[PDB]
Amino acid sequence: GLPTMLTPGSSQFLTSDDFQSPCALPNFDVTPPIHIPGEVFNMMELAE
Amino acid sequence: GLPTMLTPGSSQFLTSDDFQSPCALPNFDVTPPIHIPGEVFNMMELAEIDSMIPMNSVTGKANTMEMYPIPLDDKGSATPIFSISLSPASDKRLQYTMLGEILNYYTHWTGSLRFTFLFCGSMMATGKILLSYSPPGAKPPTTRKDAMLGTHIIWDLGLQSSCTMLAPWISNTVYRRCIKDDFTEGGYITCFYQTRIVVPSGTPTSMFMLAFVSACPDFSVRLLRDTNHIS
Amino acid sequence: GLPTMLTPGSSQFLTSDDFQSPCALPNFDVTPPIHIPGEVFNMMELAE
Amino acid sequence: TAQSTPLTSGVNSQEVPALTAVETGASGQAVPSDVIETRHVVNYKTRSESTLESFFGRSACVTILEVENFNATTDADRKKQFTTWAITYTDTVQLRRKLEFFTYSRFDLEMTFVITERYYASNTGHARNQVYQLMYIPPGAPRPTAWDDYTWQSSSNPSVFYTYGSAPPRMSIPYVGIANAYSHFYDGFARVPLKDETVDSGDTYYGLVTINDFGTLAVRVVNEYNPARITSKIRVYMKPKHVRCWCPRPPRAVPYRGEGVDFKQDSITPLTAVENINTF
Amino acid sequence: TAQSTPLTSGVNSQEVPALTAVETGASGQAVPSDVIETRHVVNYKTRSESTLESFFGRSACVTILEVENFNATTDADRKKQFTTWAITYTDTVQLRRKLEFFTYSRFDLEMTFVITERYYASNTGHARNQVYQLMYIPPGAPRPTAWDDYTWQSSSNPSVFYTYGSAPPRMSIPYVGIANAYSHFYDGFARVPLKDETVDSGDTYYGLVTINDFGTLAVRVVNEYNPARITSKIRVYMKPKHVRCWCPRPPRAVPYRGEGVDFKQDSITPLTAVENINTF
Amino acid sequence: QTSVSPSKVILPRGGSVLVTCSTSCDQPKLLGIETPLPKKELLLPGNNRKVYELSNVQEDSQPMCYSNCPDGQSTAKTFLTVYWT
Amino acid sequence: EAKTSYVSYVNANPGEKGGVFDNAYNPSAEASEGRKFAALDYLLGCGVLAGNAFVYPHQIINLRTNNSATLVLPYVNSLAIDCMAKHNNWGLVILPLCKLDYAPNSSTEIPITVTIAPMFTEFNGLRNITVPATQ
Amino acid sequence: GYSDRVRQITLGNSTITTQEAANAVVAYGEWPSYLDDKEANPIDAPTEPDVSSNRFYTLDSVQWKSTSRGWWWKLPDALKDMGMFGQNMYYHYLGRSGYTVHVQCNASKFHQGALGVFAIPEYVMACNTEAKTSYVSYVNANPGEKGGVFDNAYNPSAEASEGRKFAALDYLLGCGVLAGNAFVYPHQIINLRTNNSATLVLPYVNSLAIDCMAKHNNWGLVILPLCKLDYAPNSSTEIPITVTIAPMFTEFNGLRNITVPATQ
């Protein structure tokens, strides 16, 4: 169908990667968020 | 999801490839650069720098700081001052220069060379020195009526104390090789006392001369390889 | 990253294929051509 | 396309195309509309496969390389651990004959390495899966003395590491000739033997083989010694692409006997004698 | 491209380019159009391969790591179960020599891990297919004591899990230097030994090796012990890409004897003495 | 790299000395023996092995046998003496 | 048949007098007298059949039609310019296709004289004279 | 009217004039400057000793015999005890400095000789022992004013005591590179028929923006005799090489009490 070629680093599991993945729970209507106080946006908010 | 097909050459590791790869340190705020002086943008910026040839690398004076000064005197012999082939990557006295070490990482080279000769005698020592370049394919020049017929330059001694004999690119191939090859042989180079060097009284008779090597701005290399100095 | 599927005929070496390949000598400044006389453009120039 | 055929009929005139003169050097020039009566044939047949990009568009075989992998004790057993091959297209007789149609050629070369294995003995254990190094050594880089010396680490030499069981490794080598074309035939030496030499180069080889250094393909097995002796075979391939050629020549008739244009005595008779001249 | 060559002819004038003075520090500057008569040569040859992105554009070898996998009983057998390697480029002599052309460099590093296996003994059964952990330990994270301790689980350390038989794992490490460039050569210590110390730091190491901590590459075999002892070899590679360099230096002539710029006594003689000065 | 099998040769004045010089390579680009002594060739099959047939040996000579293997120029000599009454 | 690609310099470059072909291949077992061209006529020297040699630039002197063959040969080489002392560019070949036959005197001799001009020559790299070996 | 051979250099309250000079080498084509605000590593207030330390300092005059083999100075530490630059240095944690190295050696018109005056960034040298590697003490690596000498013989002492020093081998230039390749550095050659002074202008070269001068030695001044001194009546004469160095555009950070390093 499409001529492809496998580079090095294929079929590895890197523990700091950023890939997509199939969701094991398709169409999961997640619980709607509410405004919880004291939201941390960065770990350097805790250094100060 | 998508119909693909694996070509040959998949799952190989080629040591000269150019592929992308996942960064093992995601979001690494790299240290901001500053203007460091003397930035090199190309390895041929280093071929255009002079560097001394160990021309006096005879038995006893090699591997010490007497390898560089070429012996001179006032006797004015017809013998050559020095003689060397034009193989700046595989000759026993050129491959350890700064030009010779870069050429031992490559395989094919073109371009002209620059031999700048510094006379380190006294002030009162005046003289004339023939500097010759002969293209290959004949008798190697030994007497002065053989090297005058090539590409030469007659250099005089005085205030401006550094000549420049240029070895031009005269070659059958577009690219000579970086080995001792017969088919891409470079040329024959000699150096004769033109008249002689004359010293007055109270002045040393036996003197010395330094010899450099660099690359002209039409000098270029190809085909990176390993070297043969280190193991 | 991308959902792919391997067709038949993958990982074969066909001796009459036409694929691309990684150049083992990257940036090789090839020797510039000159006009050599008598250029053949087709093997049927030799049948005539 | 190829040429069509015009609707012509018979002639009776002084314009005579059937008579040429091959003393002048030109070949025949009569197309079949000249000497007979022809119909109109629209010709849709093209010459697309006969072009040089498709005439050389096959991955031919140029050599067969053998390496092994075992506990080497003697010195001959340590030279079975690797194999260095001088790169040339003349170690077979079929890609060579397709290239000696032409005097000069210019092509980017594409190689692919098809590799097999076997057990040597029967009851000496087993072995893990294997990775094969193939290192392109340009002329000047140090050729390996042993199979695990400083030379195989390849800090600048192009190396490929084929895991056994994968698709065969493929790479493209550009036009690396120092001329403006690869001289298939070189009618000259490498040097000029001068008058009254004490060198006495009365053994300089003729012709082609004194100018070609294309490299050395050195192959090791990257594993250490397994308990079972694994004998491998490697078939280096070439496929000329982006092909140009110059100055055509007649093809090779009698067999080869070396890297030159030489020919062996017992096969100087390529033809088979017919019964007589009148044998259909 | 490189420079062409102008059509010049002979001169007779006071403008003399053949005479320079290298006391001033500048090199020679005469191009061959100055001292002889030259034709017009249009130069299409470029310097594209000699640039630093292609001069370092090879995956070199920097070390060879060995791990095993068997039923460990003694303590030396438990230290064969893993291997921790301090990351440096100085454990070989070919990528080091290409980098000691330059004083300072700045490059994103790309690594690839080519891994082999073998059976150790012959008749101790068999083994399943294997998965290899390679964990990048930054300076400060705990180095593993045993092969299965709390450290290998890697909740924040970058780990890769290579299944044996696949394509070799590859990853790109960015510029992680705390300077604005990697100091290949550092002419200084790590601290200042003060006057009248009772510390007596009269064993502080010179130069480079007291500032470089790049990490630790700790490798285990993720399997438990198979009945057959599987001895592995791992070849860590580096390929500098996005390369910049500063302040060039002469290349290494005599061999190394350590991680510094030191040189051993029996190899201080790199040249070979010629017959005389007049030997072509 | 370059081997000369008759290294130690004793032979009287005027006679012929058979010198066998080959290389440890498969392609001898440039190989020969450097002496001012008369020699035709000796017949020997094989692209590598080689024998020159020297003759009219008068004084003590040390001929140099180069061989242009693709790893530099190599060097091998042979030692020959004469005899007199 | 002792060695391959194995011709001396004097035997490969006779100069003015040229060489002759032969209708028999007799390889000398001596490596001395075997350093010369095995000039076999029907294999044209290089082991291709002589009936295919018309793919080269050729003319046929036919003694009923013409008496002179004129060719104009450009510089053909892969390089732009090359050493003439090492490298021989062209090869002039004269094959008798149909043999000479004069009916009164069957053993007559008619001379073939070859007259060659260089054209558009250009030389580089001046030095002392090159004198090649003669033996 | 003007010539390339007469040159006056003034910095602070110090002046060098020279009447037989060659041209001056600005190292890597950059004149030294202060640390710009777009590259500043520390955030404290920088001390700029404007004229108190940007002036010429004259070192000790070594004697160049016919058997003299070379000299070396580490450049931000050969000035460690020179006026206020030696007092700006040890009262501060950070320091950058440009330099104007001026090497002074003159003879008659009957002498001859050559002096390769170099300036080597990160001049890392080799230890004089084979017991350990990268193994030099502090006092032996930082002599200060007097500098060190090269040697034409490599004798590694088997003692780890007397081996904690630079194996200053001349043809391997200390660091095991050949001396004939050292012209890729900013260099001038004092030739006793052409010139009598070598002037270099050295910017601050380091990977960092600013660094500890007490730890880190930026440049390495190297003087190699290429062709030896030869005076025909007196073959064993001595002409002095005097080195005169000025800091330029200095800038310091992190004030505290004085740093006094060890002397043994």
PDB file of C-alpha atoms in Angstrom, chain F residues 33-78:
ATOM      1  CA  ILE F  33      63.900  -5.058  -7.849  1.00  0.00           C
ATOM      2  CA  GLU F  34      66.324  -2.112  -7.835  1.00  0.00           C
ATOM      3  CA  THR F  35      69.781  -3.165  -9.035  1.00  0.00           C
ATOM      4  CA  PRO F  36      72.079  -2.335 -11.990  1.00  0.00           C
ATOM      5  CA  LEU F  37      72.416  -6.034 -12.841  1.00  0.00           C
ATOM      6  CA  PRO F  38      71.235  -7.806 -16.019  1.00  0.00           C
ATOM      7  CA  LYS F  39      67.998  -9.770 -15.731  1.00  0.00           C
ATOM      8  CA  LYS F  40      65.364 -10.883 -18.238  1.00  0.00           C
ATOM      9  CA  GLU F  41      62.549 -12.578 -16.208  1.00  0.00           C
ATOM     10  CA  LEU F  42      61.832 -16.064 -14.905  1.00  0.00           C
ATOM     11  CA  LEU F  43      58.526 -17.729 -15.762  1.00  0.00           C
ATOM     12  CA  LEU F  44      56.230 -18.192 -12.784  1.00  0.00           C
ATOM     13  CA  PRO F  45      52.419 -18.463 -12.886  1.00  0.00           C
ATOM     14  CA  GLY F  46      50.476 -16.371 -10.405  1.00  0.00           C
ATOM     15  CA  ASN F  47      49.758 -12.649 -10.310  1.00  0.00           C
ATOM     16  CA  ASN F  48      51.591 -12.275  -6.963  1.00  0.00           C
ATOM     17  CA  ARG F  49      54.630 -14.586  -6.885  1.00  0.00           C
ATOM     18  CA  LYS F  50      57.591 -13.558  -9.008  1.00  0.00           C
ATOM     19  CA  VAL F  51      61.211 -14.465  -9.813  1.00  0.00           C
ATOM     20  CA  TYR F  52      63.839 -12.305 -11.509  1.00  0.00           C
ATOM     21  CA  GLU F  53      66.869 -14.115 -12.957  1.00  0.00           C
ATOM     22  CA  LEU F  54      69.960 -12.075 -12.118  1.00  0.00           C
ATOM     23  CA  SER F  55      73.279 -12.765 -13.818  1.00  0.00           C
ATOM     24  CA  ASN F  56      76.937 -11.645 -13.969  1.00  0.00           C
ATOM     25  CA  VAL F  57      77.411 -11.110 -10.236  1.00  0.00           C
ATOM     26  CA  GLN F  58      80.796  -9.429  -9.752  1.00  0.00           C
ATOM     27  CA  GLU F  59      80.759  -7.490  -6.458  1.00  0.00           C
ATOM     28  CA  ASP F  60      78.663  -7.535  -3.289  1.00  0.00           C
ATOM     29  CA  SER F  61      75.213  -6.086  -3.990  1.00  0.00           C
ATOM     30  CA  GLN F  62      72.099  -5.343  -1.926  1.00  0.00           C
ATOM     31  CA  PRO F  63      69.111  -4.928  -4.262  1.00  0.00           C
ATOM     32  CA  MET F  64      65.951  -3.299  -2.925  1.00  0.00           C
ATOM     33  CA  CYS F  65      62.581  -4.842  -3.809  1.00  0.00           C
ATOM     34  CA  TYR F  66      59.714  -2.352  -3.545  1.00  0.00           C
ATOM     35  CA  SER F  67      56.028  -3.253  -3.850  1.00  0.00           C
ATOM     36  CA  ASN F  68      53.196  -0.727  -4.162  1.00  0.00           C
ATOM     37  CA  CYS F  69      50.566  -2.339  -2.014  1.00  0.00           C
ATOM     38  CA  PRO F  70      47.694   0.035  -1.104  1.00  0.00           C
ATOM     39  CA  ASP F  71      49.319   0.523   2.344  1.00  0.00           C
ATOM     40  CA  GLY F  72      52.355   2.658   1.420  1.00  0.00           C
ATOM     41  CA  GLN F  73      55.659   1.643  -0.118  1.00  0.00           C
ATOM     42  CA  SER F  74      57.313  -1.484   1.279  1.00  0.00           C
ATOM     43  CA  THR F  75      60.957  -2.531   1.436  1.00  0.00           C
ATOM     44  CA  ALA F  76      62.819  -5.841   1.307  1.00  0.00           C
ATOM     45  CA  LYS F  77      66.451  -6.571   0.444  1.00  0.00           C
ATOM     46  CA  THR F  78      68.633  -9.627  -0.030  1.00  0.00           C
TER      47      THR F  78
END
